[PDB]
Amino acid sequence: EVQLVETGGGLVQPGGSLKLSCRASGYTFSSFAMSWVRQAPGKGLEWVSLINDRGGLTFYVDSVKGRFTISRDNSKNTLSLQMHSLRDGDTAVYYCATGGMSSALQSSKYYFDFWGQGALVTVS
Amino acid sequence: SNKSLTDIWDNMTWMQWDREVSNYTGIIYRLLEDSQNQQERNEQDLLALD
Amino acid sequence: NLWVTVYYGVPVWKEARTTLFCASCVPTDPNPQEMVLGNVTENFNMWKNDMVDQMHEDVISLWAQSLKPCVKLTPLCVTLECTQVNADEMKNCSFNTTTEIRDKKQKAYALFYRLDLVPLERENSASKYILINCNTSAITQACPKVNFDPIPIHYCTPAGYAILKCNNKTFNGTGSCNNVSTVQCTHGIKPVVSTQLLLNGSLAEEEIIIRSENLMDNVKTIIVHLDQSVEIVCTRPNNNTVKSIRIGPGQTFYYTGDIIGNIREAHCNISEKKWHEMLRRVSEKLAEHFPNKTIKFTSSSGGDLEITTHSFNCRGEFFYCNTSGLFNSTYMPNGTYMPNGTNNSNSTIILPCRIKQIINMWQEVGRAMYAPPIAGNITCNSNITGLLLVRDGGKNNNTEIFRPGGGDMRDNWRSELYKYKVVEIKPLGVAPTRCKRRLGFLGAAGSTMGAASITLTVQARQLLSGIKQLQTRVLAIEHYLKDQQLLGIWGCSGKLICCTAVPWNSSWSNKSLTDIWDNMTWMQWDREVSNYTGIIYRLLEDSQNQQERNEQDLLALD
Amino acid sequence: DPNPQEMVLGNVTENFNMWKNDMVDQMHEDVISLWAQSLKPCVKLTPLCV
Amino acid sequence: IIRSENLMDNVKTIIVHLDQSVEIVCTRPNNNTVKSIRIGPGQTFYYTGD
Amino acid sequence: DIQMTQSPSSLSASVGDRVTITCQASQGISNYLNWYQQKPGKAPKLLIYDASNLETGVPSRFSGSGSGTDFTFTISGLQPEDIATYYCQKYEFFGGGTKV
Amino acid sequence: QVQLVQSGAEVKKPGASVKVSCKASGYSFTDYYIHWVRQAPGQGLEWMGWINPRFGGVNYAQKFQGRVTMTRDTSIRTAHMELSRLISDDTAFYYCARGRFADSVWNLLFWGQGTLVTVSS
Ligand SMILES: *[C@@H]1O[C@H](CO)[C@@H](O[C@@H]2O[C@H](CO)[C@@H](O[C@@H]3O[C@H](CO)[C@@H](O)[C@H](O)[C@@H]3O)[C@H](O)[C@H]2NC(C)=O)[C@H](O)[C@H]1NC(C)=O
Ligand SMILES: *[C@@H]1O[C@H](CO)[C@@H](O[C@@H]2O[C@H](CO)[C@@H](O)[C@H](O)[C@H]2NC(C)=O)[C@H](O)[C@H]1NC(C)=O
Ligand SMILES: *[C@@H]1O[C@H](CO)[C@@H](O[C@@H]2O[C@H](CO)[C@@H](O)[C@H](O)[C@H]2NC(C)=O)[C@H](O)[C@H]1NC(C)=O
Ligand SMILES: *[C@@H]1O[C@H](CO)[C@@H](O)[C@H](O)[C@H]1NC(C)=O
Ligand SMILES: *[C@@H]1O[C@H](CO)[C@@H](O)[C@H](O)[C@H]1NC(C)=O
Ligand SMILES: *[C@@H]1O[C@H](CO)[C@@H](O)[C@H](O)[C@H]1NC(C)=O
Ligand SMILES: *[C@@H]1O[C@H](CO)[C@@H](O)[C@H](O)[C@H]1NC(C)=O
Ligand SMILES: *[C@@H]1O[C@H](CO)[C@@H](O)[C@H](O)[C@H]1NC(C)=O
Ligand SMILES: *[C@@H]1O[C@H](CO)[C@@H](O)[C@H](O)[C@H]1NC(C)=O
Ligand SMILES: *[C@@H]1O[C@H](CO)[C@@H](O)[C@H](O)[C@H]1NC(C)=O
Ligand SMILES: *[C@@H]1O[C@H](CO)[C@@H](O)[C@H](O)[C@H]1NC(C)=O
Ligand SMILES: *[C@@H]1O[C@H](CO)[C@@H](O)[C@H](O)[C@H]1NC(C)=O
Ligand SMILES: *[C@@H]1O[C@H](CO)[C@@H](O)[C@H](O)[C@H]1NC(C)=O
Helix, strand or coil, X not given: CCEEEECCCEEECCCCCEEEEEEEECCCCCCCCEEEEEECCCCCEEEEEEECCCCCCEEECHHHCCCEEEXXXXXXXXXXXXXXXXXXXXXXXXXXXXXXXXXXXXXXXXXXXXXXXXXXXXXX | CCCCHXXXXXXXXXXXXXXXXXXXXXXXXXXXXXXXXXXXXXXXXXXXXX | CCEEEEEECCCCEEXXXXXXXXXXXXXXXXXXXXXXXXXXXXXXXHHHCCXXXXXXXXXXXXXXXXXXXXXXXXXXXXXXXXXXXXXXCEEEEEEEEECCCCCCEEEEEEEEEHHHEEECCCCCCCEEEEECCCCCCCEEECXXXXXXXXXXXXXXXXXXXEEEEECCCCCCCEEEECCEEEECECCCECCCCECCEEECCCCCCCCCEEECCCCCCCCCCEEEEEEEEEEEEEEEEEEEEEEEEEEECCEEEEEEEEEECCCCCCEEEEEHHHHHHHHHHHHHHCCCCCCCCEEEECCCCCCCHHHHCEXXXXXXXXXXXXXXXXXXXXXXXXXXXCCCCCCCCCCEEEECCEEECEECCCCCCCCXXXXXXXXXXXXXXXXXXXXXXXXXXXXXCCEEEEEECCCCCCCCCCCCCCCCEEEEECCEEEEEECCCCCCCCCCCCCCECCCCCCCCCCCCHHHCCCHHHHHHHHHHHHHHHHHHHHHHHCCCCCCCEEEEEEECCCCCCCCCHHHHCCCCEHHHHHHHCCCCHHHHHHHHHHHHHHHHHHHHHHCCCC | CCCCCCCCCCCCCCCCCHHHCCHHHHHHHHXXXXXXXXXXXXXXXXXXCC | CEXXXXXXXXXXXXXXXXXXXXXXXXXXXXXXXXXXXXXXXXXXXXXXXX | CCXXXXXXXXXXXXXXXXXXXXXXXXXXXXXXXXXXEECCCCCCEEEECCCCCCCCCXXXXXXXXXXXXXEEEEECCCCHHHCCEEEEEECCEECCCEEC | CCEEEECCCEEECCCCCEEEEEEEEXXXXXXXXXXXXXXXXXXXXXXXXXXXXXXXXXXXXXXXXXXXXXXXXXXXXXXXXXXXXCCHHHCEEXXXXXXXXXCCCCCCCEECCCEEEEECC
């Protein structure tokens, strides 16, 4: 039973910044490429950003390029996502997910295996 | 070295520069090989993405 | 789904033989920089090591390069008129030799040992003798500057190779060894020349370690590596007066002129208690290899003085102890040691060493040596750190008779170069990955294939890229350039981790990525994909040729 | 070759030490070796030390 | 195959390379008895005795 | 003591029959057995240097194999020229010999 | 061509000593072991002993110790064996043999002619 606990979120006004963080426990941290996924109220899931297991490579959905930064710390077993400008279209539940990529020396993990409980981000 | 580009490229010779940055080549060379190792692993990860 | 990824700098090695260079010959560095290889087990074979043949050649070459600029005693191969030393063991020999000016002669008298003379007529008044073997070859006098005190020799690697030490404290010499370490140089090894007893060696860490190539025949030498040394003190009590004459333009011959005081025989003292305790423990350790047999130690059954006696160099004088009061014991399966009472004794075992001067160097036959006498007396102490035993073959009534042996000087160097193996690094290799094209040396040798692909810039830089060394520098350069040329032909120039477009064929290996990168080491992988490298390399160069032609076609499109 | 091909280095100042040059030790060794390599294939006057 | 550097002067050697060999058999019919003497420390001189 | 046991002591065979000779060492742990063809009046001749490897100058009709304490020597068809006493040897220890 | 030439047959009385020689030609004498094998008339081959002509080392079998002396003369490349206290049971063909390689000396590829020693009253 792995545990991803997203500690962050709240309310921002259009033009502000907000940082999210996700702590992992129950498995080796520096071996899984983590990601974030947004679920707007009443809508489905949309992928936002992906980070590799080592943290050197980051990928984003085109709609957030240049505004979101994803980073991880393998010594603290933490993942973080720092968002700028925060438009009204970014209001959603942001889920911390484990999966999406591999290190090329392991099997393909093109799926989101373990999810978190979700942080709520509101823009008004 | 805290000299600006116009104080190095335009005013100094390579011998003076070597005499300046000489105690630090064992740090620069290590940083260069570490950066290349990181770039090689990132390149094999990007080339295995697809 | 998996493709060939070329790695350069992998902690992989193969067995090989190179001309390692001494370093007393080149100053040594602060420490050997030993990197212990975790989870690595290698197969050693002390009786097939090349480091011993190289050390043998080095010693028979340094010795024969120090007597070349020295007086040759050609003018002394003349008839000697020798009488008894009553002013046998020694004779007082008169002779007519050549002096410095090439028109006069010189009459001299020297005292020679009887073992150094051969009669020309019936031995009795003076009798005629010549120096031993002087009519068969030249006798070279050692220069007074020749160093007869063994100097420790460190063997260091050339670029591209590694010395794999063995740290198992109870290793015999042959077979798998765990806890293998990598070193750049060996410890200081003294070229001590001694027969029957190994002197001034290293002691076993744990217990007496009987080692032999095959403890079942009667040809292979049995080396007994002791854990506690037995001290031997040897002396020549005679007070000699050394005289010299000139036999040519700057050629000075040194000889014993007279002896002050009485004549006393040379001898060696070994404490009875320590020797017989040593032989008890060696007899109990040899009972673990020859179960239910009686173990006896006896004197040598035959051969020349150099192998029937204990031959050693004591401050230049070449002694030859009888060693028949030492090797006289019986140990039976009941655990009782026959010559008992030697555990509460205060006695000493006096061995009557004889002194010889015209020493038949090694067994070259066509080259002898004259050891000049030293005025006064001589005393030498040394530690007995091992035995050279030969077992008697043939039918027997369940009794082994281990008789001292020696003469072959490789078995004196196979007792300090036992833990060292020389290997050649193979930094270039291939492994499957999902990648498609579009610390210390060997420190990761025991790590998995996915944790050793980060320490590549450390086994790559330590490739470091008269005749004996220069040929190995050129050879190391050639091997480096061949590996670079392979990488270049494959399109991998300038990279340590190179992804290619050659798919992995499941017939080469059908293991999954989590069974290779996460569970296997690079040595196990090399042992797996080895019959297929002549296929993979050909596919890699063919794929690069296709990519180069496609690239020139794309670059000519416009 | 035809000329030593001397390139004058403008604005360069170097520290020489004639009394610690190695070119002198090498020349000394060369001379004491060429001289001693021309008398090796020559008659030695041993029979005249009479 | 007659071969020479220049078949017009009288200095160059003319090599005649044959296509079928002519067999030559050479012998020394004398029955020699070889004797030897020593002329130094391990230097043995061999000569015809009779 | 490594006693060599060799059997049969006497082998009756004609020309072309397959000849099998056995040698049972007391202690082995090594493939070091030699086979010697001894003709009457002549010194023995080595045929099988090592347990299986064959000796130069010996025709391919001779062979053998084995390991440890059990070795087998065979002749793929006895010839008139193959009449000899065959011995097995391990180190200094010789067998009793088989008359063929 | 490697050859081993032994002395001819000899007749001795019980208690006498017999000396047998094995001239060795064709190879380097001081690099190979020479094995002396005693062939009883109809009772098989006894190994009896080996000599190492480099330093003259010997390893006489535990049966023939005290009676079998071996020596070597390198100036004429000949090995010598001496058997003392002869008994009528010592009648045999004494063979000189060498291994094919110095590294493995039991592969007695090269043999000389047998020397017949008869012991009788
Ligand atoms: C085994 O090792 C011991 C100790 O290293 C050796 O004995 C030592 O040998 C050296 C050289 O012969 C002796 O030093 C010499 O002493 C004399 C008189 O003081 C001096 O004139 C020489 O110039 C030189 O310094 C040293 O005293 C001696 N040590 C003892 C304790 O006796 C021994 O020879 C070695 N054994 C073998 C077989 O190599
Ligand atoms: C060795 O022999 C020589 C003679 O060959 C001895 O030298 C002579 O000794 C006597 C002693 O009375 C002197 O009178 C002579 O003058 C000596 N002769 C020469 C030529 O020196 C020598 O003493 C003998 N030495 C030993 C140790 O026996
Ligand atoms: C070197 O000299 C010694 C002594 O003269 C020679 O040994 C003698 O050689 C003759 C040869 O006929 C024998 O008869 C003697 O019995 C030998 N004497 C001893 C004491 O052994 C020796 O042979 C000479 N070396 C050579 C190569 O001829
Ligand atoms: C030295 O030469 C003389 C010449 O008369 C001779 O008598 C003498 O015996 C020679 N000495 C020796 C030791 O042979
Ligand atoms: C050394 O090797 C022996 C071989 O039996 C093994 O039992 C022993 O554990 C090894 N010792 C160490 C310290 O690894
Ligand atoms: C030496 O140790 C190895 C360990 O594998 C063993 O096989 C061999 O029999 C031993 N030999 C002796 C002579 O002790
Ligand atoms: C292996 O060898 C090293 C050498 O320093 C030693 O410290 C270590 O204890 C050894 N390990 C074992 C298991 O014998
Ligand atoms: C050896 O012991 C004897 C006992 O009599 C003694 O005289 C002699 O001096 C000792 N020798 C040495 C070298 O200690
Ligand atoms: C040692 O001394 C004994 C005394 O009986 C003698 O028989 C033996 O031959 C001697 N050994 C040597 C090697 O000289
Ligand atoms: C030898 O004798 C001389 C003269 O009596 C003396 O000076 C010297 O010290 C003695 N040497 C020894 C080692 O006894
Ligand atoms: C012999 O070994 C002991 C070990 O403690 C050492 O103290 C002693 O100096 C050694 N002796 C020689 C002569 O090397
Ligand atoms: C050796 O294996 C052990 C097994 O527990 C492992 O913990 C250790 O990291 C390994 N060491 C190396 C250097 O690979
Ligand atoms: C050469 O021919 C002559 C003819 O008389 C003959 O006697 C001689 O033996 C021959 N020589 C050879 C070497 O065939």
